[PDB]
Design a protein around this ligand. Structure first.
Ligand SMILES: [Gd]
Ligand SMILES: [Gd]
Length: 327
């Protein structure tokens, strides 16, 4: 699935562009009423969906996610979010959703139909074929939507870990084995990593991993117990950090050793992408409630798509045994 994965990188960056554009364009920034958040989510999910189907006929039906492909507008009209094929079509659709705001509709249409040529050269070497018929996809188009809307660009991290801020927003695309539920491939895109104070432009960062029939490869990691838990976490060196996607990334990058979440309020789309990448490094994700009585989370079967019993995410099974002993 190296060709699929390479394509997943491109679209994730296209999704990062949309996400950045909605906070940077004058018109888009200012946005039972007009619910821009839902719009931005649905649109990004649909961009990923339409692009993949385009490149790999048949995959479109296999792409599942957090959002629906439908929206209710200001008049109570239900709009099926189908973009294209031309940019003109996309403007008509978005102005149905936005009451007739032509400036905001055009601005969004531009970024949506914008060509992206993002390619990791290390992945161009790799040639792995995975049968298309065994793949499912879980998308979280913009994770940590609270942090995305608040838009704090100014936060200092505690020991490399951002407690909140635009850094906590991730685009999450995960690929799993339909028959076995096991995650196979993952892409995480942080659209908001570094901001230049003088130009105000954001640079982002992309992470990938693949774990297929014993072949394990991942993106090059920048260098530089620790436990990250959510803002709302109430279970008895610990850091608060917003974002389900982002806390997972902390474990991937080695900024935290353990990410524990005790509630039932994360879902398959929150964890799939990161679980695949953790798998490719020798880690994974276990059901928290089960350990308190090493069984990995699965992605094919419904309970409905909540990770019931919570989770522990780990990079090292050694660290996991260490932590599970303490507790
Ligand atoms: Gd959402
Ligand atoms: Gd989410």
């Amino acid at each position: 699935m190296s060709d699929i994965l390479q394509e997943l990188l491109r679209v994730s960056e296209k999704a990062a562009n949309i996400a950045r554009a909605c906070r940077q364009q004058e018109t888009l920034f200012q946005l039972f009423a007009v619910d821009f958040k839902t719009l931005a989510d649905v649109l990004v999910q649909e961009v990923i969906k339409e692009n993949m189907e385009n490149k790999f006929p048949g995959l479109g039906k296999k792409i599942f996610g957090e959002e629906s492909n439908e929206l209710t507008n200001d008049l109570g009209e239900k709009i099926i979010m189908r973009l294209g094929p031309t940019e003109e079509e996309t403007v008509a659709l978005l102005s149905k959703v936005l009451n007739g705001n032509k400036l905001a509709s055009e601005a969004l249409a531009k970024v949506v139909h914008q060509d992206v040529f993002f390619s990791d050269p290390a992945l161009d070497s790799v040639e792995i074929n995975i049968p298309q018929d065994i793949l499912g996809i879980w998308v979280d188009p913009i994770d940590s939507t609270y942090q995305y809307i608040k838009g704090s660009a100014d936060i200092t991290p505690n020991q490399g870990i951002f407690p909140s801020g635009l850094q906590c927003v991730t685009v999450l695309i995960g690929v799993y084995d339909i028959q076995t539920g096991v995650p196979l491939m993952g892409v995480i895109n942080q659209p908001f990593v570094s901001q230049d104070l003088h130009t105000r432009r954001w640079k982002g960062q992309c992470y990938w991993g693949l774990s297929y029939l014993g072949t394990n490869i991942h993106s090059l990691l920048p260098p530089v117990v620790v436990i990250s838990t959510s803002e709302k976490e109430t279970i008895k060196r610990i850091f608060r950090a917003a974002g389900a996607g982002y806390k997972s990334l902390c474990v991937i990058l080695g900024l935290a050793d353990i990410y524990i979440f005790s509630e039932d309020t994360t879902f398959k789309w929150d964890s799939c992408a990161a679980h695949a990448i953790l798998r490719a490094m020798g880690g994974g994700m276990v059901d928290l409630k089960e350990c308190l009585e090493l069984p990995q989370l699965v992605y094919h079967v419904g309970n409905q798509w909540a990770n019931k019993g919570g989770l522990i995410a780990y990079r090292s099974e050694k660290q996991l045994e260490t932590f599970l002993s303490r507790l």
